[PDB]
Design a protein around this motif. Sequence first.
Motif, PDB file in Angstrom:
ATOM      1  N   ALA A  45      -0.390   4.933  -1.047  1.00  0.00           N
ATOM      2  CA  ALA A  45      -1.024   6.192  -0.694  1.00  0.00           C
ATOM      3  C   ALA A  45      -2.312   5.940   0.075  1.00  0.00           C
ATOM      4  N   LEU A  46      -2.871   7.021   0.609  1.00  0.00           N
ATOM      5  CA  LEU A  46      -4.098   6.980   1.387  1.00  0.00           C
ATOM      6  C   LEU A  46      -5.079   8.013   0.851  1.00  0.00           C
ATOM      7  N   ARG A  47      -6.301   7.572   0.583  1.00  0.00           N
ATOM      8  CA  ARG A  47      -7.390   8.445   0.177  1.00  0.00           C
ATOM      9  C   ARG A  47      -8.281   8.723   1.383  1.00  0.00           C
ATOM     10  N   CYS A  48      -9.423   9.353   1.128  1.00  0.00           N
ATOM     11  CA  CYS A  48     -10.323   9.723   2.210  1.00  0.00           C
ATOM     12  C   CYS A  48     -10.946   8.475   2.833  1.00  0.00           C
TER      13      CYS A  48
ATOM     14  N   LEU B 285     -13.576   5.883   4.128  1.00  0.00           N
ATOM     15  CA  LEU B 285     -14.960   5.624   3.748  1.00  0.00           C
ATOM     16  C   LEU B 285     -15.896   5.743   4.943  1.00  0.00           C
TER      17      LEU B 285
ATOM     18  N   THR C 237       0.837  -1.191   0.000  1.00  0.00           N
ATOM     19  CA  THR C 237       0.000   0.000   0.000  1.00  0.00           C
ATOM     20  C   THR C 237       0.875   1.245   0.000  1.00  0.00           C
TER      21      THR C 237
END
Lengths: 49, 49
Positions: free
Chosen positions: A34-37, A39, A32
């Motif tokens: 990157a990190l998104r918003c 959920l 892994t």
Amino acid sequence: HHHDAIGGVNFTLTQPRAHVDLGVGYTAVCATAALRCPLTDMGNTAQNL
Amino acid sequence: QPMIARDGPHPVDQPVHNYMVKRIHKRSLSAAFAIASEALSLLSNTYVD
């Protein structure tokens, strides 16, 4: 494959295939990056038993 | 639109065609131009002066 539908007929084109992993060790590495918003919510919803 | 192939217990997808209709919107442009009364009296001679 042939079967009827609500308007006309439906053609289902299928194709069989097979896969072999011919590696002695591990030939694929994922990580892994990157990190998104998030959920979900980090709220306070107490579980009811 | 394009379409992809997948296996397993998902319903088989069919390609989708989209049709769209737009229409015009009418506008205008306006500008003015004025003539003085003395200029109208001068230009209405027609070979008397």
